[PDB]
């Protein structure tokens, strides 16, 4: 009756097959599992690549799945995601910086980027207010190539955050990544500009913590789960089942993920 939408973005067939087996064995057939390329709700996206239709890329440190090394840490990493076009077409994150060099008009693209940053900034400040932190950390790659997209990102993110009344501290990519992996307790809320390096940093943090499920906020309004490994996908499915209104099944999947990461399907 109900439907779970599986999106594949750069994920090996093994992970997708594992996810399908897990849901089928745990759900028992009550909720069907259909595959697609875009969704707004009841969706799990497998693979490092960012799907189409997501504007925010928040991720946290769930208490249940905290690794013993990272016990007690509490930091929220939100990556701003610009609208994604077809693979052949030039992405906005690159168009916004190259068209300016080429002299092409960049009005509509700026407007679209501004809207995406505002939504991401609103999500980040809401998380910061909920956690109670007073200052957030913006992350922008300091490469000369990305001298326009980051500039707009800073101009808008700081504007929205300052309007909300919180402080912003701008930093690069290498220093923040090292701090987040080594001393993450000194960062409460960190926003990341839309760059490939930032995406890798988000994945590394999601994996080093012990394997977690990232939350994507889409344009249509909602939250969709995202995973890249067996444990992360298993946690993503468990959260998705919990959202559908299944508590016991979600707990079983979470327990199986904690015990046997690479073979949860057989473990449960």
């Amino acid at each position: 009756s109900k439907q779970l939408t599986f999106i594949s973005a750069g994920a090996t067939a093994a992970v997708l097959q594992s996810a399908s087996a897990i849901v089928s064995k745990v759900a028992g057939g009550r909720v069907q599992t259909k595959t697609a390329k875009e969704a707004g709700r009841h969706a799990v996206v497998v693979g490092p690549e960012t799907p189409i239709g997501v504007h925010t890329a928040v991720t946290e440190v769930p208490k249940s799945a905290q690794d013993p090394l990272f016990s007690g840490v509490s930091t929220v990493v939100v990556r701003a995601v610009l609208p994604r076009a077809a693979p052949d077409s030039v992405q906005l994150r690159d168009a916004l910086d190259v068209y300016a060099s080429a002299g092409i008009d960049t009005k509509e693209e700026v407007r679209s980027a501004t809207e995406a940053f505002k939504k991401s900034a609103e999500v980040a400040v809401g998380k910061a207010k909920a956690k109670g932190v007073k200052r957030i950390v913006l992350v922008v790659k300091q490469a000369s190539k990305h001298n326009c997209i980051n500039e707009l990102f800073k101009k808008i993110s700081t504007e929205t955050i300052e309007s909300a009344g919180l402080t912003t501290e701008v930093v690069g990519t290498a220093a923040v990544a090292n701090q987040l992996i080594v001393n993450p307790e000194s960062l409460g809320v960190v926003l990341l500009n839309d760059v490939a390096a930032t995406e890798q940093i988000e994945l590394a943090f999601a994996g080093v913590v012990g394997g977690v499920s990232r939350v994507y906020h889409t344009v249509e309004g909602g939250k969709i789960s995202a995973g890249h490994s067996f444990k992360s996908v298993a946690l993503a499915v468990a959260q998705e089942l919990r959202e559908l209104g299944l508590s016991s099944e979600a707990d079983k999947v979470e327990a199986a993920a904690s015990k046997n990461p690479r073979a949860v399907v057989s473990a449960l």
Binding site: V90, D94, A95, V98, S101, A102, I104
Partner: protein, 57 residues
Amino acid sequence: DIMVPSFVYNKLPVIHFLQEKRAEQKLRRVLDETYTEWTEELDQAHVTDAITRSLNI
């Protein structure tokens, strides 16, 4: 038969000269309005750079 013909004959040279000058003026105006339109086209180096960026390199 006599008078108007003579005055027409007297008119002929000046009118011929003025009409030749007018034709030369027309040709000169035609020539002066010709300009070569050198257009500028987007350098392909930027296109190559965008292609590289899209590859995530």
